[PDB]
């Protein structure tokens, strides 16, 4: 028997595996003029990584005030419910220059990869961005008078980007495989060097779509200088002295524009999630066939999508030239039946009505609202784990109700039920 | 607490006054639909622009609506809140003014016109005074 919080591995207690329309899920909430934004959550081995940016004013265009990068532990709060406790917090000096952080756990530390820019978000100012990456290492259990043990910068000697001009982390969390860490990343490729056959664009059954739409939707607009390609940044700790990050591109199997992504281990194998930021609006997740080169075995899911805008709203499947959507990941909790848990936004074109759902490729077995309808919600990050062999999920949800003073993320704890009736 | 009344973006809409267009006054939390109706079809690209671009009837941006499908109903919904599926930072701030225009001449050959068009000739423009009156 194993007590405490631990990775979703081995043989957990079985979970309810048929469709139920009644509420059997019970979300538990865990612990002026400001908006807290750009959130990150990672849960690995009883520890977690967290980050956010505090802004004065709007969440989009407010003045960046404080960046928090913290780690902690996930524990039994005594009553058989997980809760989170911060142990080590770091606030870098210039909050407006830190972008797109990504955290991966390895035994004593979380390693957090960020992008540094003096021109804003590299995605929105790609051509003016000078690629610059930062690495901060944080001990999950800090020690007094331990030198560089608690907090450490790591200087990156070399970046191996292949044919790409620029690369940077793109997504909340990555994994370790032995002593090698992988971060979700994105590569910047000039359109003139992009190798693509326009005849792979699936325009049959879409009379208004044209063969060029897929290639044109590989960048943030039709005439972007770059296209964005998802992948991984690889950091092999076993090497001596050398901090080298190499980019590993994702395969062109069900290719979509590079978007924030997550690679995680569930029941012992790597799983991948890529946000749907263009015309292919059905959820993109699946088991990883190969890590290098990165290849994802995408599920053929017909139940989960994301809100969009006019051109590619929720449930759009026909190739259009669009760049819109939300990041709402899902976490594989049973490979034998391929059931995952995650939060989706139950709206066609608006960021509202968050719903926690447990689902299969072609059906949602059970779900529950996290708030009321017309409650505003955005990015959601889900990680599920074991608490004395019961599957639990923790979801970070960007959420607020109209009229709130403070826009803040919330943490939700959901126990996955064992029996369905 | 409300869903505002939908705006049909076609020339026969009488709520676009001559020379003035439509003025709205939506409040924080409202929802709005801008619909390009189903079908002789009118073709538009509809944009959100600044005060100066609306007064001179010019565009220079990614459209909010791309009405080039005579077969289908195209819809755009806004909730006047901080969060959005827009990746360019679409937000609506109370006591701020937002302008929606189209520079198309209505024909398929004029979808991408960048001056004049149906904004200065039909006053097919929306003025949203967010969180006012
Ligand atoms: C949110 O958006 C949903 C998706 O909208 C659609 O997709 C996006 C990407 C855009 O392309 C939009 O323009 C699309 O509308 C929307 O749900 C859609 O709602 C449609 C009705 O408005 C509905 O019906 C249409 O298709 C059927 C046939 O459907 C077949 O295939 C699916 C695929 O699995 C099957 O599941 C279905 O069972 C069907 O077999 C048409 O028959 C129907 O039309 C009529 O059919 C005539 C043929 O004889 C035709 O000439 C004539 O046009 C008739 O009107 C529709 O055209 C879609 O099936 C549905 N899609 C999904 C995925 O659910 C949501 O609508 C809800 O809105 C409320 C108000 C209500 O209308 C509900 O029906 C609907 O679920 C959108 N939600 C909101 C809140 O707006
Ligand atoms: C990470 O780096 C280590 C260090 O080189 C790699 O391990 C070695 O790799 C080669 C090829 O497998 C062997 O010939 C060496 O004998 C290995 N030595 C040791 C001590 O492991 C490792 O393969 C690298 N892993 C990744 C994923 O890059
Ligand atoms: C999702 O659907 C695609 C297409 O239906 C599947 O791809 C097929 O996979 C089989 C087995 O690997 C191949 O023999 C076919 O050639 C593939 N292409 C087809 C049928 O067009 C894919 O395997 C499906 N993925 C999952 C997880 O079910
Ligand atoms: C992009 O970079 C330029 C400097 O090259 C800067 O002046 C401009 O404000 C930036 N804009 C955005 C949207 O990042
Ligand atoms: C694109 O694919 C088609 C058929 O799959 C092939 O005949 C064609 O040569 C390809 N295009 C190029 C430029 O090679
Ligand atoms: C629309 O504009 C194009 C040029 O931009 C012009 O050639 C065409 O005749 C115009 N059509 C109408 C109906 O105004």
Residue numbers in the entry:
A (entry chain A): 174 to 204, 213 to 602
B (entry chain B): 27 to 65, 72 to 92, 95 to 167
Q: Would you copy out the relevant sentences from the publication that reported this structure?
A:
The henipavirus G glycoproteins have a type-II transmembrane topology, containing a short N-terminal cytoplasmic tail and a long C-terminal extracellular globular head. Distinct from most other members within the subfamily Paramyxovirinae, the henipavirus attachment glycoprotein does not hemagglutinate and neither binds to sialic acid, nor retains neuraminidase activity, and instead binds cell surface protein receptors.
Four copies of complex were observed in the asymmetric unit of the crystal. The complex buries an interface of 1272 Å2, slightly smaller than the 1354 Å2 buried in the NiV-G/ephrin-B3 complex and the 1393 Å2 - in NiV-G/ephrin-B2 complex. Ephrin-B2 (S27-D167) used in our structural studies here was expressed in stably-transfected human HEK293 cells. Ephrin-B2 undergoes very minor conformational changes upon binding to HeV-G and its structure in the HeV-G/ephrin-B2 complex can be superimposed on the unbound ephrin-B2 structure with the root mean square deviation (RMSD) between equivalent Cα positions of approximately 0.5 Å. The only region on ephrin-B2 that shows some rearrangements upon HeV-G binding is the G-H loop. These conformational changes within this ephrin region are necessary to fit its four hydrophobic residues (F, P, L and W) within the G-H loop into their binding pockets on the HeV-G surface.
